[PDB]
Design an enzyme around this catalytic site. Structure first.
Site, PDB file in Angstrom:
ATOM      1  N   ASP A 188     -11.531  -4.412   0.891  1.00 46.75           N
ATOM      2  CA  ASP A 188     -10.386  -5.082   1.417  1.00 46.75           C
ATOM      3  C   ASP A 188     -10.601  -4.930   3.218  1.00 46.75           C
ATOM      4  OD1 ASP A 188      -8.228  -6.800   1.571  1.00 46.75           O
ATOM      5  OD2 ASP A 188      -6.850  -4.762   1.940  1.00 46.75           O
ATOM      6  N   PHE A 207       0.785  -1.038   0.058  1.00 49.96           N
ATOM      7  CA  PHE A 207      -0.038  -0.101  -0.013  1.00 49.96           C
ATOM      8  C   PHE A 207       0.826   1.350   0.052  1.00 49.96           C
ATOM      9  CE2 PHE A 207       0.730   1.081   4.527  1.00 49.96           C
ATOM     10  CZ  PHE A 207       1.059  -0.297   5.046  1.00 49.96           C
ATOM     11  N   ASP A 260      -4.304  -0.694  15.597  1.00 49.15           N
ATOM     12  CA  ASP A 260      -5.168  -1.426  14.319  1.00 49.15           C
ATOM     13  C   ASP A 260      -5.668  -2.733  15.110  1.00 49.15           C
ATOM     14  OD1 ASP A 260      -2.331  -2.700  12.640  1.00 49.15           O
ATOM     15  OD2 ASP A 260      -3.487  -4.063  13.991  1.00 49.15           O
TER      16      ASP A 260
END
Ligand SMILES: Nc1ncnc2c1ncn2[C@@H]1O[C@H](CO)[C@@H](O)[C@H]1O
Length: 269
Positions: free
Chosen positions: A131, A17, A92
């Protein structure tokens, strides 16, 4: 001249990414995240010709705090620079689950609920993330709010079939594995099912393609009958047999969800 309105900091992370750096916006010392993407590394573009990720973030970045908002962006000779919000402290979902293990259903309920509100937001804005998974979910530990990240595999929402997918295989639906085709909303629901299982069992349910197409889901952890039912429903083998967002949010297991702050004091502080 981005190299002036922001002061770069340490490298937060990197991978499929780009490279993300912690930063600060000299103007209000606002904590931001600076993401770099090489032009040669992207395949989707939209509109001036900018990477799809920017088009997606823009349509989704005004108001609702369910998704990390795109504050600004710049183009460079061989790359694009994205200025994203940066909550702090944060963690996260992947790391959070990895450290605490399986989550109590009350916490998973609050988390899942917020992910659903965020996904509805994107869809309502014409954006499909494609995603959804633990790694792409950020937790603001103090406010108890989750935020979606990395729309780099996303696409504009459409009603026709999709024939491309560069998301995460283990989170991909049976129809993609078998026919290399799927529809937006129902594929999204399937990944939502993988996510939920991940939250209450502390790990994804399927590892091999055969398991994904088999559809049998085994619980390695103790989870309520209502939760098992929602999970199985979202993971229905036939796309049309999966619940709609409305049906998920109206599911018995989804009632009495805690508020973000309440979630933070009981489980995060
Ligand atoms: N917008 C963002 N704000 C804060 N941290 C981010 C952001 N985007 C990516 N990251 C960090 O980079 C990691 C890459 O997945 C995330 O787990 C998170 O720690």
């Amino acid at each position: 001249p981005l190299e002036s309105q922001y002061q770069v900091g340490p490298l937060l992370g990197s991978g499929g990414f780009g490279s993300v750096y912690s930063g600060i916006r000299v103007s209000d010392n606002l904590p931001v995240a600076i993401k770099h993407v090489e032009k040669d590394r992207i395949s989707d573009w939209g509109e001036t010709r900018v990477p799809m990720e920017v088009v997606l973030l823009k349509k989704v970045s005004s108001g609702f705090s369910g998704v990390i908002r795109l504050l600004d962006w710049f183009e460079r000779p061989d790359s694009f620079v994205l200025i994203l919000e940066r909550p702090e402290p944060v963690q996260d979902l992947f790391d959070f689950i990895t450290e605490r293990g399986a989550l109590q259903e009350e916490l998973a309920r609050s988390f899942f609920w917020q992910v659903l509100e965020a996904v509805r937001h994107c869809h309502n804005c014409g954006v499909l993330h494609r995603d959804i998974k633990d790694e792409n979910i950020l937790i603001d530990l103090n406010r108890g709010e989750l935020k979606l990240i990395d729309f780099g595999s996303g696409a504009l929402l459409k009603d026709t079939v999709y024939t491309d997918f560069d998301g995460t295989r283990v989170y991909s639906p049976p129809e993609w594995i078998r026919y290399h085709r799927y529809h937006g909303r129902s594929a999204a629901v399937w990944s939502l099912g993988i996510l939920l299982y991940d939250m209450v069992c502390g790990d994804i349910p399927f590892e091999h393609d055969e398991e994904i197409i088999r559809g049998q889901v085994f619980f390695r952890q103790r989870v309520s009958s209502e939760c098992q039912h929602l999970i199985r429903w979202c993971l229905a083998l036939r796309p049309s047999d999966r619940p709609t967002f409305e049906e998920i949010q109206n599911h018995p297991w989804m009632q009495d969800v805690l508020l973000p702050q309440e979630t933070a004091e009981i489980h995060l502080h």
